[PDB]
Amino acid sequence: SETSDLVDISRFDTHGLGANYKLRRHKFEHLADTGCHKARSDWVKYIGPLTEFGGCNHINGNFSAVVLPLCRPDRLELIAYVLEFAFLHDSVLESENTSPESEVQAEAGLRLLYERCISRLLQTDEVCAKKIAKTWKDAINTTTKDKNVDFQSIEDYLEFRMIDTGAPFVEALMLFGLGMSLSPQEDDALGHVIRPCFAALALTNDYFSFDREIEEVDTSTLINSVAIVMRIQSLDIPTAKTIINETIQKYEREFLRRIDEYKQHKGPISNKIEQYMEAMTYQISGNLVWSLNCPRYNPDYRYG
Ligand SMILES: CC[N+](CC)(CC)Cc1ccccc1
Ligand SMILES: [Mg+2]
Ligand SMILES: [Mg+2]
Ligand SMILES: [Mg+2]
Ligand code: NA
């Protein structure tokens, strides 16, 4: 209980999500808010006017402060800056109304801030930074190539969606915040464990960001499991959302199973991998609680 405080997740209406996941909130949240502010200022300086919220949420906690509550305080500002640029660039990648001329116009500014992120990370922790650069580029490239694929099942969708939502990229940021690197063997084995975590994160995002993504569908590619379920099963919004809610609960339980299965088969586990597992579980609770009222998805929490 050094970088963060335990928060009782049962004080929030999580719609049955998050059972058996503990919630923590970083004590240095101000540093995350600072990173978000600076990234937003840099976006206006080099790219254009801001159109939306990113990770800030002063009520339930800045995204980085609740998703990555074990971050070293000296790394939290940079991580929040990187994620804020990712939140804003994400909407650019999904956009459909950008003229070719505007796309060309933004490119060098987006490149400047991308490279600024990578260079600052590399100067801080070269090993950890290389994993962030690799996963970020994979997320950007996969979104760009595959965002209009017509998926015919949630299972197929999720193999794209875990990359499109940047789950491996956030994992690489989390490791950076811990000052942690994994061996090639740990990487191989932990990938199996964290797959259901990535699915739960992506589907939870879909659940809480659906309304906003429909509001934007006139200018933005719709990438959302609730819509897939509506189409495949001919269901309305609340019924499809219930299916997605049940599916999140399935993946949440699966991740807890795989953590304990790893301990039972490949254990006693090191303190390092123990902290890795715990840190991954905090992404689930933090993502969930942040999404309930973040201004990005919830219009009556917006200002400015
Ligand atoms: C909602 C935030 N994010 C990453 C920036 C996409 C914009 C998806 C994500 C959520 C939680 C964990 C990992 C990825
Ligand atoms: Mg996206
Ligand atoms: Mg998006
Ligand atoms: Mg979304
Ligand atoms: Na969209």
Numbering used by the authors: 5 to 308
Source paper text:
Here, we describe the discovery that class I terpene cyclases are bifunctional, in that they catalyze both terpene cyclization and aromatic prenyltransferase reactions in the same active site. Class I terpene cyclases require 3 Mg2+ ions for catalytic function, and these metal ions are coordinated by conserved metal-binding motifs in a unique α-helical protein fold. Interestingly, the diterpene synthase FgGS can accept GPP as substrate donor to produce long-chain prenylindoles 11–14. Compounds 11 and 14 were characterized as previously reported (E)-1-(3,7-dimethylocta-2,6-dien-1-yl)-1H-indole and (E)-3-(3,7-dimethylocta-2,6-dien-1-yl)-1H-indole, respectively. This characterization implies that the active site cavity of FgGS is sufficiently large to allow the binding of indole as well as C5 DMAPP or C10 GPP to produce prenylindoles.
However, the second aspartate residue in the aspartate-rich motif of FgGS is substituted with serine, so this motif appears as D94SVLE98. Interestingly, Oδ1 of E98 coordinates to a Na+ ion outside of the enclosed active site cavity. Additionally, the aromatic ring of BTAC makes a favorable edge-to-face interaction with F67. Additionally, in the upper active site cavity there are two ordered waters (W21 and W22) and an ethylene glycol molecule (monomer A), or five ordered water molecules (W93, W101, W126, W222, and W263) and an ethylene glycol molecule (monomer B). The binding of the bulky BTAC molecule reveals that there is more than enough volume to accommodate the small 5-carbon prenyl group of DMAPP in the active site pocket.
